[PDB]
Design a protein around this ligand. Structure first.
Ligand code: HEM
Ligand code: HEM
Ligand code: HEM
Ligand code: HEM
Ligand SMILES: [Fe+2]
Ligand SMILES: [Fe+2]
Ligand SMILES: [Fe+2]
Ligand SMILES: [Fe+2]
Ligand SMILES: [Fe+2]
Ligand SMILES: [Fe+2]
Ligand SMILES: [Fe+2]
Ligand SMILES: [Fe+2]
Ligand SMILES: [Fe+2]
Ligand SMILES: [Fe+2]
Ligand SMILES: [Fe+2]
Ligand SMILES: [Fe+2]
Ligand SMILES: [Fe+2]
Ligand SMILES: [Fe+2]
Ligand SMILES: [Fe+2]
Ligand SMILES: [Fe+2]
Ligand SMILES: [Fe+2]
Ligand SMILES: [Fe+2]
Ligand SMILES: [Fe+2]
Ligand SMILES: [Fe+2]
Ligand SMILES: [Fe+2]
Lengths: 158, 158, 158, 158, 158, 158, 158
């Protein structure tokens, strides 16, 4: 079904956000894993998978709307050197993606692409979750201190 | 453990190949899926996952050797417009990756990084499999003709 | 038990046929497998195993009759370059083996080696089956055409 | 994938070794079985199957590398007349095959055919096992004497 | 159904062989059992049962063909005094029975009694097995020596 | 099978490394266990078992190659007095063993002892793992501080 | 708990005996295994494990008593060249260890270290078992002769 050009454009831009998140989250995960912070690797890895599911959704939708998914262009990854900096980088990235999602959702509604909109709201809800997780971790680091925070990631949570 | 700089370099270059394959294979998969060629989507999707496993291996190894995995730079994706062109593109990409693997493996051996080498040979064996699959599909297209080939992908293989 | 010399001779000659069939059928099988004609590989492989069972029977019988099984001499393999030629080669080979079996069976009967004869009739019945399979495939190729025939082998039969 | 001509050549030569072993081992097995040395038949039969698996590996690889597997030419079988002579013959044959494998493995490495090399090392490890088994049996014959050795093969080992 | 007189005659003669074998084998079995050669008792007992099955077959067939089964006349039993002599006696008896079976089978064929013939060939195949067993045991006695042979029968084979 | 003298020499030297590791790791394990650092005892004990498996491999291979395994000579154990010093000692020992393994692997390859080489690469991969574990623990001690590190070992990891 | 110095000394000396036994028994085991004497390898391997359990007991006890377990010093291994010599060597070693155990046990009692003593008596009981096994095997070799003895080890005992 021929979709609206600007919707497909937004979809590609959002897809673009997803696949920077996928890489940044995945590298972060395996950095944590290397440092033996087993728990941060499990969670951050899981978020990489979430982002993939998002990307898959955009791709299938763009294709359905008869546009060309663009996986060529990759945004700036901002990879940290320590736990805080890296969590803080994921948060800024989540926040930027959420801004773009808000914009796209409003636009989809006004050209009547309600199913694209419905898909994007589900995704936004997921993002809002990722944001909540990051914010809480970052505050915990400050509340309990870095050393205790680190000790608390050595063991995977059941 | 501090690894050899040129090994890490090769590892990053190989990682780079993996993540172009991941994207190209994934987009291809969902293109097939859209066209209703269910079987090509299953197989090509599976190869995307294989490539991810490869990437994960490089990342963990680079990190272990204390280098910086580079997920920033993305090579040229060559996406086709029809089944043949797209399979043919995956094949040229596999072949180029195999060339790089051969060089890296020989180099790892000469600096005594036998476990990197052992990892890369396992990967090369997987690639050689992907190559075999592509070659066979491409020949089948020619042997049975395009129409029959297409009909043969409509149904997922049990 | 000392057997009749000419029976043992026939048994060795028949054994000889078996082990050309074993090789030709096995190579054929893996040629098909390579070309992705999964179904022809399953069937032709199974016929290789049948031929092995036959060879085993001759060997044990020759040894029982106190002769020397001869696995040294190998007849001409005629390996094809395409499906038809290769099936057609297996058929001519089956037919020649059947001719030899008929001659041996009659001879066994006239020197009273009824159990060798009984073994050879069971084997001949198997051959007659292999012959039937080849004949049917070759006719199917002509009835439905080569392209359709080929498409029909891509998937293993449950 | 077009392989290196001399690798394919080595592969065919190695295949050639396999299929002499297959025959010699199989005939040996059924000779033992006839003599009621049940245990030597089980083991030697199993080694025949191993050799077949090896042959299958070469054939599929040669075909993959786009060469022609040669099952026409059969080397000299050296079949013994008694247990020792026959075991001793299998050992010399294993040793010759191991020499050829060493040479091929080194050559594969230098033309960068690492997956052929990897396959051949797995095979060589198997051969080294067959060699170990033969050596031990031959020494046991000498340590316990022939009569006791023979009595020890009457019953299949659980 | 009225059968051919000479077939019934052969059937009775063959029946006659069976029931000498039944007795000789059974006595042999229990002689071994007494001497504690548990394994020879199991095997030889089993052969007694086989012979009974044979006798049963003849009796039912003779009766079906409307002749009178003759269980009155019993041939010469040749019972040994030691393992070898006794095995050797069973072998000569098997060989004589096989000679008679060959004659009868040929005769049945020429008067068109194909089902009697078919029954007799099945039986002959069984005899040929009994013969193989005896021959192998007798050779084992010579290969490993009498003392080792005897020790090897003390324990029933699982 | 007569192996190459210098390979057997390397094998003995490597065996020698294994059995110092076995002792040092085992003593370390039970020191931790005494101090109530349950988790370090589980891990370090497991590494002792790994080293044993390694030693077993060398011994069987040396014997197979017809050399004499030397378990007489024992290197310097360097046992620590506190967690860090002891982990740090295991690390230096792992690193030295890895150096020797690299030397031996290269040598095996050049005398064509590919199966010894294949065994040693598997082992080296294991060592590389032990090294990774030590490095991570040592860094964790520094990141979270000694007190928190210690508290984190009181409980065995599920 | 601070233990008595001379008890710890005895404990280390006894530990010392254990770990020579561990090595000698293990090498012996794998020598038998190589020669195909499967049964002697199983038993002798099991005795190596027993000795390890003993060593573990000493180490934990020494540590508990606050002494330093000494795994540095290794006594003379006396490795045989044939089954008898090797069994005979294990026996002399067991006997010497038993002498040391008797002295230590008496000493523990007189300084009131009853739990060390209780541990050592359990161990002595195990040794006495190992001694019984060796003595019986050595006598069996003489009673049945070497050839029969050897044949009797070819098969693992269920
Ligand atoms: C380029 C860096 C990437 C890495 C290192 C990576 C890594 C991984 C790994 C290790 C898995 C686990 C395989 C499994 O068991 O399912 C996975 C799953 C998956 N990946 Fe990726 N991935 C990457 C990018 C992508 C991209 C670009 C896509 C497509 C938009 C994608 C789509 C998926 C999907 C759909 C799954 C299945 C999730 C599940 O069902 O568990 N990935 N990824
Ligand atoms: C020419 C003399 C040969 C004899 C007498 C022989 C005999 C046998 C027998 C009796 C079996 C058991 C069937 C089963 O249950 O799988 C077998 C299995 C097999 N044979 Fe052969 N064989 C011969 C040569 C070959 C050759 C030349 C090849 C191809 C290179 C081959 C390939 C195989 C394979 C792949 C199996 C399956 C093994 C398994 O999965 O158990 N054989 N052979
Ligand atoms: C004269 C000496 C014979 C002796 C000492 C003997 C002994 C035995 C014994 C102990 C059994 C085991 C019973 C059971 O559990 O089935 C048996 C079974 C049997 N007997 Fe006999 N037998 C003799 C002759 C015969 C004859 C002349 C026939 C008829 C032709 C015969 C027919 C059978 C049959 C059909 C079985 C059943 C086998 C089975 O199903 O296990 N026997 N015999
Ligand atoms: C140095 C030469 C040694 C060799 C070649 C060796 C070999 C082995 C092997 C192959 C195992 C089997 C692993 C398993 O499945 O449990 C084992 C087990 C074990 N080893 Fe050792 N070992 C040696 C020395 C030691 C020492 C010095 C100790 C400590 C005093 C020790 C303590 C143990 C323990 C406690 C087990 C577990 C037994 C079980 O639960 O099955 N070993 N050994
Ligand atoms: Fe989630
Ligand atoms: Fe997302
Ligand atoms: Fe997100
Ligand atoms: Fe795969
Ligand atoms: Fe890859
Ligand atoms: Fe690939
Ligand atoms: Fe069949
Ligand atoms: Fe056949
Ligand atoms: Fe056939
Ligand atoms: Fe095997
Ligand atoms: Fe082989
Ligand atoms: Fe072999
Ligand atoms: Fe039977
Ligand atoms: Fe009978
Ligand atoms: Fe009989
Ligand atoms: Fe481990
Ligand atoms: Fe090790
Ligand atoms: Fe290690
Ligand atoms: Fe025990
Ligand atoms: Fe002990
Ligand atoms: Fe002991």
């Amino acid at each position: 079904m021929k979709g609206d050009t600007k919707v497909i454009n937004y979809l590609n831009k959002l897809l673009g956000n997803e696949l920077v998140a996928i890489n940044q989250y995945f590298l972060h995960a395996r950095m944590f894993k290397n440092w033996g912070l087993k728990r941060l690797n499990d969670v951050e890895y899981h978020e990489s998978i979430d982002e993939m599911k998002h990307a898959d959704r955009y791709i299938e939708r763009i294709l359905f709307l008869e546009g060309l998914p663009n996986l060529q262009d990759l945004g700036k990854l901002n990879i940290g050197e320590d736990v805080e900096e890296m969590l803080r980088s994921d948060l800024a990235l989540e926040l930027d993606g959420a801004k773009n999602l808000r914009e796209a959702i409003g636009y989809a509604d006004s050209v009547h692409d309600y199913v694209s909109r419905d898909m994007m709201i589900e995704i936004l809800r997921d993002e809002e979750g990722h944001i909540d997780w990051l914010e809480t971790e970052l505050d915990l680091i400050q509340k309990m201190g870095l050393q205790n925070y680190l000790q608390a990631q050595i063991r995977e949570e059941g």
